[PDB]
Structure formats: C-alpha cells, structure tokens
Amino acid sequence: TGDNSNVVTMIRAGSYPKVNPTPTWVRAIPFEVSVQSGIAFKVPVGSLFSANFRTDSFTSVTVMSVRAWTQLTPPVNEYSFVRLKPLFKTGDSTEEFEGRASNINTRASVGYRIPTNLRQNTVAADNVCEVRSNCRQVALVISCCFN
C-alpha cells in the first residue's frame, strides 16, 4: 500500500497464486566484438547468454533491435564507419545499414529494428548480424527479450 506506515502490517492473503520461478526478461545488453579490416564479422547470439549479464539461465532470446558504435579510433586520416547486415535463419538480408562519424575523434553509429513478423526465437548457435568497420572493435547494444 505505499506507506507513511512505520511498522509491519498484515496482508490478508487468499488462495495460492499462479507462480513462475523462471520468468522472461526485457533487456538492453552491451558487449564488444573484435573486427578485422575488410572482413565481415558474424555476431553470435551465444554472446547474449552469460553470467556477466545475469542471463546464463536462458537458452533462447527474441531480438528486437540492434545498435552498434565504433569502440576504438579509426586509421590515420579516416573518419570511423560501421555497417550492419541483418541475418535471419529463414533468409539473410542484404541491407548494409551504415553510419559514419563527422568528426575524426567521434564514434560512428547505426542500428536497425527487427519487424514483428521476424521476431522469432534464436539460440546460441544462430547469428544476429554481420558487422563491418574500419575500427578494430565495435560496441553493440542489443534490445531483446530473454525467454
């Protein structure tokens, strides 16, 4: 009931309720991946299941959106860039969403949203997307629903 109350008070409990010891969880997971120049890196869904994110008890996840930022400085004379290519078990996309920095000292960023019709579960062996960048590390923040 909120408060103003300074002592323990009785709750008039009823019948035993429906319960669930292992619920779902909506999250924004931050992690980094190492990228090599001119080579696409396939980001594994397995990266989302870890004690470091309190998610090692889940075996599936529904990804809703993916955002990426360059995480280290770009090569001399260049502006940072990052590209994302969505991957799906039913058929990979060929879109190459790209963000470029406008100040050499700033991160490049881009993201993409997955439509409802493509929001099925993915497991550790599946891949989320392909990342390309002129920077050696890319930081991702993935919005998803663990279940």
Ligand X SMILES: O=c1ccn([C@@H]2O[C@H](COP(=O)(O)O)[C@@H](O)[C@H]2O)c(=O)[nH]1
Partner RNA sequence: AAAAAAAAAA
Residues in contact with ligand X by CB under 6 A are 1-3, 11, 64-65, 113, 143
Query: Counting Cβ atoms within 10 Å, is residue 58 exposed (0-12), middle (13-18) or buried (19+)?
Result: buried
Q: In this structure, are residues 70 and 133 in contact, taking their beta carbons and an 8 Å threshold?
A: yes
Stretch that binds RNA, among 8-16, 86-94, 101-109, 120-128 (CB under 7 A): 8-16
Output the smallest distance, CB 24 to ligand X, in A.
15
88 binds, among ligand X, RNA, its own copies, none (CB under 5 to 8 A by kind): its own copies
Residue carrying structure tokens 């779902």? 24
Give the nearer residue to its own copies in terms of CB position, either 41 or 93.
93
Residues 43, 68, 128, 131: which binds its own copies (CB under 8 A)? 68
Restricting to residues 118-137, which ones interact with its own copies according to CB under 8 A? 118-123
Residues 11, 39, 51, 125: which binds RNA (CB under 7 A)? 11
Residue 33's identity, in one-letter code, is: V
* Contacts by 48-57, CB closer than 8 A, 24 or more apart: 48/142, 48/144, 48/146, 49/124, 53/27, 53/29, 55/25, 55/27, 55/29, 55/146, 57/22
56 binds RNA (CB under 7 A): no
Backbone angles phi, psi at 11, to 5 degrees: -115, 125
Structure tokens at 4: 């103003």
Stretch that binds RNA, among 20-28, 41-49, 78-86, 116-124 (CB under 7 A): 20-28
Restricting to residues 26-45, which ones interact with RNA according to CB under 7 A? 26-28
